[PDB]
From a paper:
15-hydroxyprostaglandin dehydrogenase (15-PGDH, EC 1.1.1.141) is the key enzyme for the inactivation of prostaglandins, regulating processes such as inflammation or proliferation. 15-PGDH represents the key enzyme in the inactivation of a number of active prostaglandins, leukotrienes and hydroxyeicosatetraenoic acids (HETEs) (e.g., by catalyzing oxidation of PGE2 to 15-keto-prostaglandin E2, (15k-PGE)). Human type-I 15-PGDH is encoded by the HPGD gene and belongs to the evolutionarily conserved superfamily of short-chain dehydrogenase/reductase enzymes (SDRs), within which it is classified as SDR36C1. The enzyme has been purified from human placenta and its primary structure determined by Edman degradation; it was subsequently cloned and characterized as a homodimer with subunits of a size of 29 kDa.
Numbering used by the authors:
A (entry chain A), B (entry chain A): 0 to 265
Write the structure that this text describes.
Amino acid sequence: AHMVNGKVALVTGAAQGIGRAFAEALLLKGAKVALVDWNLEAGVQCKAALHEQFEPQKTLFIQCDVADQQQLRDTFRKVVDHFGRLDILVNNAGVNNEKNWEKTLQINLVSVISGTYLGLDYMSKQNGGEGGIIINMSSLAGLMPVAQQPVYCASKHGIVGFTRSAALAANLMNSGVRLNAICPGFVNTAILESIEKEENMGQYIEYKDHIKDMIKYYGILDPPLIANGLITLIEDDALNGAIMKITTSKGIHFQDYGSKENLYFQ
Amino acid sequence: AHMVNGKVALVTGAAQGIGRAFAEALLLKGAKVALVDWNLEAGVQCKAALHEQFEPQKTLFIQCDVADQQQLRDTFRKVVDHFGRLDILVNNAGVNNEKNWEKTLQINLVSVISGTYLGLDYMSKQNGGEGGIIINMSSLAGLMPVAQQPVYCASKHGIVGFTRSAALAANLMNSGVRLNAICPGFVNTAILESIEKEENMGQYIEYKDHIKDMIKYYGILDPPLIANGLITLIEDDALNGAIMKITTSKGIHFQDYGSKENLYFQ
Ligand SMILES: NC(=O)c1ccc[n+]([C@@H]2O[C@H](COP(=O)([O-])OP(=O)(O)OC[C@H]3O[C@@H](n4cnc5c(N)ncnc54)[C@H](O)[C@@H]3O)[C@@H](O)[C@H]2O)c1
Ligand SMILES: NC(=O)c1ccc[n+]([C@@H]2O[C@H](COP(=O)([O-])OP(=O)(O)OC[C@H]3O[C@@H](n4cnc5c(N)ncnc54)[C@H](O)[C@@H]3O)[C@@H](O)[C@H]2O)c1
């Protein structure tokens, strides 16, 4: 197994919710963490609050809209300049908005790809890095349909195909970078609350009760549980292209795509 | 079964390759077809050539970049103004380009969503339409990884999640619109040739032989075979949210997601 202690992590959407859980779990495991978020106030407050549990030198906050490509490039550069290295990238920022759905794709999918590629720019052995791990936040919505969130579902499916593909490319390139995704069920955060608002649901707002019924039936995961999954991916050297599911029913487990790579051609 | 004769189809990327096969198959079945493409010359030549087999009044050509949202809206309006109705939308335009990958997402995914939503704007029973069918071109790359085409793979996975989701939403809304996707193996067109060019493959150009080897092993489908799949979807009233695969091994067949909708939560 890989030891987390002393590694440098860049976590997007780290100011709150699952991102903040990731930052906390990483810090407890001895990592240094660059918290990256577009929410300036929540980001600064998050770092300030973390000073009480962790030495201030363990964290850095950088304000960044992940969908602004020059902003995101500048952010990676500042992180590497500050900590001297990059070992773990977590592309976690995401939103739910079926009304302004183009922006949802830009944040949820386009920015996961752009951040992944910047991670490879720094970490690939062939680019002068020493390898590392990139973890992309998908959802169960990356594997099954969501009638009330078709664009969110598209963005999450996008992450699964991209991640499995980039993981194979990394093997071919001998970049030493492992790429995995996490697909949680419902988690207790601000994204879950957005299903109540026409601002976020648009034409789908009338059907929101179907989601609420699901949440009542299956229950809600605590963000730390998702962080346990992240740590698992980081520590297990054999996981590349893994699609990790996390649910109330089965806890941490994996999508099984079988042992026949070209199944669908056969 | 639904009869194709007399229905009005809008086919994007209709100037060549699979889109043109779709237009030809639809015309033979008695449909009227709006051929939509950004390639002005190939589009005009395509309509001109089709006059030899079909009455000129069966076709309309409209130049349109599907990624330009105002252009695409204007295009739907011109189609409905011309033919008086819209029954079949085929979001088929797509590209392969891992270098300019943001544009690939805009064309392959964003424009499929934008066109789908415009199809629903016209065809939904709740918007004053009478229902219809929307067919989105995915690929086997929508269901399995492609090491040399991770963004193309992301775009195609996006279409599968979006399509299955929008199909469920249509049921909830009683829009009378069926939404399905087609996932072919390799097909003999200009997209297949693009794997040879660094312009289109970027960082993945060195690994192109792995794709070529696959093509040699599994063989190549003729575009008319894909058009047979399209006609099947249009004529079979029971197909909604179907993910149709078309391969040299099995011909036309379907991805089976099983009879347990919430499997992944259980
Ligand atoms: N909460 C759930 O039920 C659930 C389930 C599955 C997957 N997810 C995924 O988990 C990830 C984190 O979401 P969350 O539930 O913690 O939601 P959240 O709203 O609580 O946290 C998201 C964070 O991302 C930040 N962010 C959003 N857009 C950004 C941008 N453009 N640039 C920089 N920062 C941005 C926000 O400011 C916020 O701090 C998302 O990708 C989400 O899709 C959540
Ligand atoms: N050829 C294959 O092996 C294969 C396999 C699976 C899926 N597909 C999918 O089939 C669909 C059609 O591709 P094809 O193989 O016939 O390729 P093609 O290059 O031969 O035809 C694509 C057509 O789309 C048009 N187009 C591209 N971008 C456009 C835009 N922005 N606006 C308007 N028109 C645009 C082109 O001008 C062209 O006429 C694509 O979505 C492709 O991803 C192809």
